[PDB]
Design a protein around this ligand. Structure first.
Ligand SMILES: CCC(=O)Nc1cccc(Oc2nc(Nc3ccc(N4CCN(C)CC4)cc3OC)ncc2Cl)c1
Ligand SMILES: [Mg+2]
Length: 269
């Protein structure tokens, strides 16, 4: 039993062991029914793990939202960092998709409405996530309201503030979810995240990536050679969902849907 402020956990109660964090279940030390997740350095990748967890503290201490995993406390030192976070008892979207194979439009809509709510806060704060993918979208059952299941965006280790007249250029994220401009080593902005979201939505709908390749390098070459990208959308797809996907999965960020359009899109009614 280790303690971090008013919280405790045991390293028996593993949640998961990523390359840049190890996460354990724990609880408040007074209020034992308040569950938490405690994120720790992965010493196999100490320097990078420490950097990412420090960056996550900097971003998350500024974000309170129902659809973003909450940072309850943290403890940063020269050689160790801990985050104490809201426990998401439903696990990740990736595991859910692995079981469901595909999601109905109504479920996509429920989840996407919540993601958009989170993204509205990020966009208003000038923050880009840069690693949106099903492994970083968590589910929580916190319930006498309709559709009480909650989506929570996690893993802000790669996120940054981006001033509204500036472009980012750091290469980070997961190749299969990365916007073309990102993986082609160009300058990008907040619309890179909208591509990632479009690819998650497409994956939920069809069970596949919109643009398949054998490796990151292959996917890059594919985007380089194809000046327009058109995802294959099933004929059964509703017209608002088809239009949303086509507007999100535009190769060129200038042509891609922007935030205001995304938040007010007919599909999300
Ligand atoms: C390798 C999986 C992992 O550790 N992934 C992850 C990714 C992002 C954040 C995170 O931390 C948290 N995880 C949870 N919950 C949670 C997260 C992941 C799972 N998995 C993921 C897939 N595995 C195959 C099974 C369990 C189970 C979980 O509960 C039940 N709740 C709060 C935080 Cl801060 C953990
Ligand atoms: Mg961009």
């Amino acid at each position: 039993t280790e303690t971090v402020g008013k919280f405790e956990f045991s390293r028996k109660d593993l949640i998961g062991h990523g390359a840049f964090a190890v996460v354990f279940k724990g609880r408040h030390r007074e209020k034992h029914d308040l569950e938490v997740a405690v994120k720790c350095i992965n010493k196999k990748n100490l320097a990078k793990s420490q950097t990412l967890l420090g960056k996550e503290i900097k971003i998350l201490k500024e974000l309170k939202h129902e659809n973003i995993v909450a940072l309850y406390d943290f403890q940063e030192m020269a050689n160790s960092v801990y985050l104490v976070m809201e426990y998401c008892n439903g696990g990740d979207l990736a595991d859910y998709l692995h079981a469901m194979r595909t999601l109905s439009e109504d479920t996509i809509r429920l989840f996407l409405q919540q993601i958009a709510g989170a993204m509205r806060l990020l966009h208003s704060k000038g923050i880009i996530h840069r690693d949106l993918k099903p492994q970083n979208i968590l589910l929580s059952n916190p319930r006498a309201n309709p559709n009480s299941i909650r989506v929570k965006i996690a893993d802000f280790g790669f996120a940054r503030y981006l001033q509204s007249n500036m472009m980012a250029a750091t290469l980070c994220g997961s190749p299969m979810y990365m916007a073309p401009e990102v993986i082609m080593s160009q300058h990008y902005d907040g619309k890179a995240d909208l591509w990632s979201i479009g690819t998650i939505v497409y994956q939920c709908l069809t069970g596949k990536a919109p643009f398949q390749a054998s490796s990151p390098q292959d996917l890059r070459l594919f985007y380089e050679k194809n000046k327009t990208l058109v995802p294959t959308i099933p004929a059964a797809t509703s017209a608002p969902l088809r239009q949303l996907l086509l507007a999100l999965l535009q190769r060129n960020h200038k042509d891609r849907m922007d935030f205001d359009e995304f938040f007010h899109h007919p599909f999300l009614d």
